[PDB]
Paper text:
O-Phosphoseryl-tRNASec selenium transferase (SepSecS) catalyzes the terminal step of selenocysteine (Sec) synthesis in archaea and eukaryotes. Whereas SelA is a functional homodecamer that binds up to 10 tRNASec molecules, SepSecS is a tetramer. Despite possessing four equivalent tRNA-binding and active sites, SepSecS only acts on up to two tRNASec molecules at a time, leading to a half-sites occupancy.
Crystals of holo SepSecS diffracted to 2.25 Å, whereas the native and SeMet binary complex crystals diffracted to 2.32 and 2.07 Å resolution, respectively. Our 2.25-Å resolution structure of holo SepSecS possessed a phosphate ion bound to the P-loop in a distinct binding pocket as previously observed. In holo SepSecS, all four monomers are equivalent, possessing disordered catalytic P-loops and C-termini. Moreover, in the absence of tRNASec or large anions, the predominant conformation of P-loop residues (Ala103-Lys107) clashes with the placement of tRNASec in the catalytic protomer. Thus, positioning of tRNASec into the active site requires organization of the P-loop. Structural superimposition of SepSecS tetramers derived from our structures yielded RMSD values within ∼0.4 Å, establishing that human SepSecS adopted the same quaternary structure in all crystal forms.
Author numbering: 8 to 464
The structure:
Amino acid sequence: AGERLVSPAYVRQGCEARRSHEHLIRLLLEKGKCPENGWDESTLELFLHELAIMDSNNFLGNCGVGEREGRVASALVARRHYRFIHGIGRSGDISAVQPKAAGSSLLNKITNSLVLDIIKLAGVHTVANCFVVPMATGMSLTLCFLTLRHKRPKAKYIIWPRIDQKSCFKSMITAGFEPVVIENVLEGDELRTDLKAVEAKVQELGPDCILCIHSTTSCFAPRVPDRLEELAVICANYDIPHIVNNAYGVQSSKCMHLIQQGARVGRIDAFVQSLDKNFMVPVGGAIIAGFNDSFIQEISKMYPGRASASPSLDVLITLLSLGSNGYKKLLKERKEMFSYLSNQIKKLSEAYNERLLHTPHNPISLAMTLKTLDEHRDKAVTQLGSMLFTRQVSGARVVPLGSMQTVSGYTFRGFMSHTNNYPCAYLNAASAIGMKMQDVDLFIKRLDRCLKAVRKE
Ligand SMILES: *Cc1c(COP(=O)(O)O)cnc(C)c1O
């Protein structure tokens, strides 16, 4: 409005240009959905700075005489968080609007609305409610289990189809329940759910003694996502809650449609996803989503005290920068890289007298056999994982046979294989969101060089 110096025509075009940024911000505040095209950084930072001004710690004429005033010692800390200091929620409700932080409260509502829009876009079009929690997937599963205790005070067991992952297994024990490990059935090369053993354990222990059935979608090959439809029917019949571990299944349309079809024909009370694995942000946050708004609110109000806004801000920045088209592009390129990674493993397996485990139901992880490797006591399988780690290859885990691990008092036989005696040792490789073609070409090149070193030795 300073037309005293600059000509009025040029100030009018600049002030009218600001209306274009306010148009994008208004559309987000009204519809609460992910924009199709990503915002420019100029629009995003203008939006973030305007939100932070609404927080009482950033008021020009504010005075504080309490114990939690959002004071910041280091200017580096304040700037790297865009001056969002008060966090999210209140002492009694993590979903409540914080009176001292209107901008942080609005940031939390918009983030959960953007996340809900992505969950529908990813495949679960029928999701009712969700919320971001600044805890990992393991601790977020624990929060679901802690909520179910007060609704099922006579239950002490959690029925859990086996998956060799320490975080989700410890969630059941951290919540104070006893996991009932259901071994998997070897159908071809795939380890799938044993529906007969699951329903048998329900009748042996009694439905009232079961806290919930804890299934899992995204997992390492040769394990595949659980039969969520049949497990949801069992949960609906015996009136047992169903909690789905969907750690990195948002990036997979097959995983999300499983959760959708399971809630369509049966019962799914909540499914939990990781922020870092599905949205390419730092580790630390998760999403608790469900189809019963009454129950999702119960989980949210079960959280004691305020919580960090840092994961919510990272997801807000990322989704607004990518847009719904930007996220869709990454979902399409992940399917392309999955086919490319599969074909490169097939070609490399033939040259070394190996094969690719046929796991068509796992759309993220692959497994190449390592049968023609260890000379019983040559330690070649263990050496391969160390040589790959030496040549700066991460994410390719090696699963040997006969491994035994004790996790929180429970001893697993055949650890990392999801079963007691898998036929052979294998090598894992996955196509996750954001993987470039250079990752596969460097992986194949360095894996080939590592295999030559063992064959030559
Ligand atoms: C990511 C992961 C988890 C939990 O990871 P956190 O360390 O809690 O963030 C649980 N189950 C599976 C299959 C996972 O991949």
